[PDB]
Structure formats: structure tokens, C-alpha cells
Design a protein around this ligand. Structure first.
Ligand SMILES: [Cu+2]
Length: 115
């Protein structure tokens, strides 16, 4: 069901290698966001997306299992090394959202949804 990726090369080549290129416009009101869930943080940080846009999160791990839950939303997904977790969401409220990892409570990320 989930797309496969080589976890040993995910940080050197491909769409998760450069966090400055994590946000790719794939349509007029559509963005794909390549998120790396690693020990112990998120890449990019912060994730910046416009409000009302369809976001396609493509999340993967180069090490161990991580969680990807965006507080105040129903986004609650497991992130496995070598597998791509896909989350589709449209943020209707601008502001800052916290990304939470259940196994690592010291691991935090930020999403900024712009007006
Ligand atoms: Cu974690």
C-alpha cells in the first residue's frame, strides 16, 4: 500500500535530500510537501503552506519509526523507515500548528499556514 524508498540514501538524493526544496507546487492550488521524520525532529521546520491550498504530505524516516500528528487536526499517521506516508489536508485556518511524535515526546515540529 505504501510507496517504497531507500532509507540509506533518502538524506543524500531524492526529494527529501534538500529541505529548502521540500515544498513543490503540483497544481494551481496544490502543494506536495516532502517531510523527513528523523531522530529527533522534523525536516523542514517550520513547514510553510498557504491556507486553503490542498497539501499532499509525503513523509518518511531515515532511521526509526516516528509519528506525524498535527495538533487540532485528524492528521495522525505512523512514519516508517523505507516507506512513504501520504497525508492529504487543506488548512482552512492560518496560524501555527504543532507536529507531535507519540514514541518521542521531546520531538516537535511546526507547521505555519500563511494567510
Ligand atoms: Cu519521533
Amino acid at each position: 500500500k505504501l510507496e517504497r524508498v531507500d532509507p540509506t540514501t533518502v538524506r543524500q538524493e531524492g526529494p527529501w535530500a534538500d529541505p529548502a526544496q521540500a515544498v513543490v507546487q503540483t497544481g494551481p492550488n496544490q502543494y506536495t510537501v516532502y517531510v523527513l521524520a528523523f531522530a529527533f525532529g522534523y525536516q523542514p521546520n517550520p513547514i510553510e503552506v498557504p491556507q486553503g491550498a490542498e497539501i499532499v504530505f509525503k513523509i518518511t524516516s531515515p532511521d526509526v519509526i516516528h509519528g506525524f500528528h498535527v495538533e487540532g487536526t485528524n492528521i495522525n499517521v505512523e512514519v516508517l523507515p523505507g516507506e512513504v506516508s501520504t497525508v492529504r489536508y487543506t488548512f482552512k485556518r492560518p496560524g501555527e500548528y504543532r507536529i507531535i511524535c507519540t514514541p518521542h515526546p521531546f520531538m516537535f515540529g511546526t507547521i505555519v499556514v500563511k494567510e
